[PDB]
Every structure is written in C-alpha cells, then in structure tokens.
C-alpha cells in the first residue's frame, strides 16, 4: 500500500497565484488612496493663507464687485462660496535653489 499509493507524481504543480489574490484582499493596495479621498480627484489643491491673501490678491476669474443677492436663499455667496484655489500653489523659487 506504500508503493501503490505513493506515486512519483509528475506534471502537477501546486497553485501559487492564489497566494497573491488573498495577499491583496487583505492588504488592499489599490484601495489605499480611495479610503480617505473625498469629492473629485485633484492633483493640485493646496495654497497658503498668506500667498492667496497678501500676494496673489484673491481670486481673479470671480466677480470683482458684483455681489448678487440670490433669488432663493438668504446669503451673499459670490465672495464666500468662491473658495479661492486659482493659479499655481505656494511656489516662490526654492525648488530651483535646492
């Protein structure tokens, strides 16, 4: 029964791909940037509170003087809801010297 059942057993190699399917279900590597991401994808969003307030002189494509009172709701938003994010981020030429 030792010789009969124990066979030299050619051909069949055990599966190694299914290692790495359960590797990635537990790790979740393509999911790591989808966890805390919110609203739309955006590569450039940051700006300082000095550069936009003292150097960039606020948002350019917005209304400079026009302040509408909206037909429905009790608010003058086109200065507030603008949320200035225009132009390049905080950059003044120090990556150039490094």
């Amino acid at each position: 029964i030792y010789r009969k059942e124990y066979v030299p057993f050619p051909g069949h190699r055990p599966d190694q791909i299914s290692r790495w399917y359960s590797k990635r279900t537990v790790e979740g590597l393509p999911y790591k940037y989808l966890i805390t991401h919110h609203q739309e994808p955006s590569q450039r969003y940051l700006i300082s509170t000095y550069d936009d307030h003292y150097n960039r002189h606020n948002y350019h494509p917005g209304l400079p003087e026009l302040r509408t009172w909206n037909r429905h709701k009790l608010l003058w938003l086109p200065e507030k809801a603008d949320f200035p994010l225009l132009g390049p981020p905080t950059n003044y030429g120090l990556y150039e010297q490094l």
Binding site: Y2, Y6, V7, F9, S18, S22, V26
Partner: protein, 432 residues
C-alpha cells in the same frame, strides 16, 4: 532560517511522516528526488550546491523492513540515507523492551544525528514528535528521547502529535500498560500533546468523503493536513502569522494540563467542493461540533479552557471575528469562567494543497482547531478503568518485570495519574 526539527518514532510515526512529507514535497515545489519566488523551504527543507532540498528530519524505528521499504519506494534519493535510523529487532509491543535494552543500544546513534542537524540550523525553534502512544517503539524509545533532549537542549518547544489509542476499538492487548507508562515520563517533559485517534478519521473517511474500505494511508493524510496547517505560518506568509511557540505558551495555563485536542474542519470530497460554498461561518461552526472531532470524547461533558483557531486561505479577519462572536454567545458550548478570552487567530494566504487523486479537494479556505478541554479526563479515566481491571489480575507483568524494569514502577504510574485526573477535576470547577 526558522527551522523546526521533526522527529518521528515508531511505525505510526514513520507512516504518518510519509504523508506529512509527501505534502511538504507537494506544496513547496519539490519533485520527489530532491530538486525542483516566495515561501520558505528553509524552514523544513535543506539546500546544497546542487539545488537539492534534503528533508531535515529523522525517522527512527526498531523494524527494519518499513525503513527498507522507504529506501526502495518512491523517496529513495529524497531522504538522505543515514538520517533514516532503523534497528534489527523490534520492541514487540512492549514498554520495557523499548526502554531499557533496545533503546540503550540505539539512542547514541540517534543523538549523534540530531547534533549534526542542529549545528547547521541557526533558528532552531522547536521539536515535532510523531509517536504511537500505545505501541512498543513509540512508548519506550520516545520516553528515552524525551528524557534526553529535555535535559540537553534546555527550554525549547516540544510539540507531539501522539497517536492516542481509540477508546472502543483497539489493535493491541497490552495498550494500557504502554499508554500509562509513557505519559508518566512525558508529563513533565512536554509542552503540548495533541491526541488523535484512528476510528474517528475512519468515520470521516466514510461519511464525509464517500469512499469505503478506508486504510491507514487514507487516514494519515488528515494527520498530514493538520500538521501542515500548523506549520505553514512559518513555511508561508500570512496576515497574522502564528509562530511555533504560540501553541507552547498561549494554549496551556498550567504545567500538567498540556493535552489539547485537534480538529480539521473542511473535510469534503472531490465531487463536493466544486459543488459547495465554503463560507467562513459554516467552516468554523462545524469545527466545534462533537461529531467531527479527532478523539472520541464529548466536549459537552467538559468545559473548554483555551482554544486556538488557525485559518488558512481566502479568509478575512472580520469573518473570523463575526463567526467567533456567534460561538461565544452560544449556550450549549460550555466555556470556563476564569479564562474568558480563550481564543487565538492565525491567518495564512493559501488553499491547502491536495494529495494526488485523494479523498480531499481543493478547498480555498481551511480552519484548524487546537482546543484543550477538561472533558479529556473522561478519555483518561477509561484507561484508568482498563488499567485497574488488568493489574488486579496481575496480568502480563512477567514480560515487563523480566526485562529489567522494576515492578514498582507500575505503582507510581498510577498515583500520578490519579493526581493528574484530580488536577483536571480541580481546574474543572467554577470559582465564585
């Protein structure tokens, strides 16, 4: 480089080792002569400048033809042909024959080999001891081995898969003499003793696998599955890896309790695993059932004290935690008060590999359970009863005492077994 050595004693030890090391050469790609990314054969196999992976273990028996069959079977060039140790005369199902005469003449050759295997290893973590618990070689020569490697090697982990004799059916006639005397010596020199039976896996081979006339070869595969599920946290990568000394220090609370009980959950046939949904709830809930447990004993009669759940495959920790929670809130699974956590989780990343044309199938996820229970005192009180009947007859002592062993060693074989039952009853009581 985190090798643990496996030592197999007796006909039972070497025969379950053939199934244990078939799979090792199966799972790690090792064609059965020695040659062939991830993983670690260095944990269980060797290397050389020819690509060859020597099975770093030792098989010792007092029967020459079984080892001679290994040297003439399939794994000739695989095993290195002087680390397979054999003798010219068997113990003939006797304790003292394997303890005071046959053991002395062959132990120095065994200890020489395990020296030159420990020297090449830098990360020796522990010992795997595969021995028959009611035989001649596995009762006597194991006892000498445990006496010697527990003293010389200091504090290392020593896990044994003792082949516990079945309660109702038995092969021997002098089994309670061999069984009680070997667990006397190995009580103080072991770390966990995992009992398995032979009738239970015969039942599992019948009701779950739909193949009749089961032999020992179809049995040792499920023993091989359990050892593989235990050791693959070292052979392979996993989410929550569980090393070898976790069972050693995290399953036993007292030095004389170390008798846990093994269960392999997903037993299923080849025509049923394409054909059934493996679910994490269905696999570990059926593992608690008394009907599919590897020693014939009812855990409902006793209380669970510590448990260790080993998961292996496409398994997430949440489905482990959800399923282990619904076990905790179940009334019929009686659980001890003073050990309220009582659980361990181990995760591996592979389906268990399947033997060629066997009675098992390619399950994508498996659960191995190692739980210790005070209900096992019922299994040892039966051998207490069988010792009482056969020693009051003064039966068959002359084979034992006439071979150097003092008759009075039959005595302290029992009062310590009385206290070990007594220690199991006292830990067996609720505290309030």
């Amino acid at each position: 480089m985190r090798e643990c050595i496996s030592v197999h004693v007796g006909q039972a030890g070497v025969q379950i080792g053939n199934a244990c090391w078939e799979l090792y050469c199966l799972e790690h790609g090792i064609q059965p002569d020695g040659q062939m990314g991830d993983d670690s054969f260095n944990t269980f196999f060797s290397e050389t400048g020819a690509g060859k992976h020597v099975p770093r273990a030792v098989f010792v028996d007092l029967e020459p033809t079984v080892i001679d069959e290994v040297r003439t079977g399939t794994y000739r060039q695989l095993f290195h042909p002087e680390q397979l140790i054999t003798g010219k005369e068997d113990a003939a199902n006797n304790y003292a024959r394997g303890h005071y005469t046959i053991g002395k003449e062959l132990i120095d050759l065994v200890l020489d080999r395990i020296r030159k295997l420990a020297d090449q290893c830098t990360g020796l973590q522990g010992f795997l001891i595969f021995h028959s618990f009611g035989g001649g070689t596995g009762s006597g020569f194991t006892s000498l081995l445990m006496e010697r490697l527990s003293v010389d090697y200091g504090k290392k982990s020593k896990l044994e898969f003792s082949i516990y004799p079945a309660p109702q059916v038995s092969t021997a006639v002098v089994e309670p003499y061999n069984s009680i005397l070997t667990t006397h010596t190995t009580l103080e020199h072991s770390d966990c003793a995992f009992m398995v039976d032979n009738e239970a896996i015969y039942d599992i081979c019948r009701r779950n696998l739909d193949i009749e006339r089961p032999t020992y070869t179809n049995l040792n595969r499920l023993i091989g599955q359990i050892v593989s599920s235990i050791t693959a946290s070292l052979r392979f990568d996993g989410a929550l890896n569980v090393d070898l000394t976790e069972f050693q220090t995290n399953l036993v609370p007292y030095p004389r309790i170390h008798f846990p009980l093994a269960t392999y959950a997903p037993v299923i046939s080849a025509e049923k695993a394409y054909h059934e949904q493996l679910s994490v709830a269905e696999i570990t809930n059926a593992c608690f059932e008394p009907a599919n447990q590897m020693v014939k004993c009812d855990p409902r009669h006793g209380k669970y004290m510590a448990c260790c759940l080993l998961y292996r495959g496409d398994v997430v920790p949440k489905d482990v935690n959800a399923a282990i929670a619904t076990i905790k809130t179940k009334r019929t699974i009686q659980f001890v008060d003073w050990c309220p956590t009582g659980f361990k989780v181990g995760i591996n990343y592979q389906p268990p590999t399947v033997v060629p044309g066997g009675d098992l199938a390619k399950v994508q996820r498996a659960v191995c359970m190692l739980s210790n229970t005070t209900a096992i005192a019922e299994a040892w009180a039966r051998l207490d009863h069988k010792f009482d009947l056969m020693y009051a007859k003064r039966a068959f002592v002359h084979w034992y005492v006439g071979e150097g062993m003092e008759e009075g060693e039959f005595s302290e074989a029992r009062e310590d077994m009385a206290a070990l039952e007594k220690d199991y009853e006292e830990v067996g009581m609720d505290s309030v």
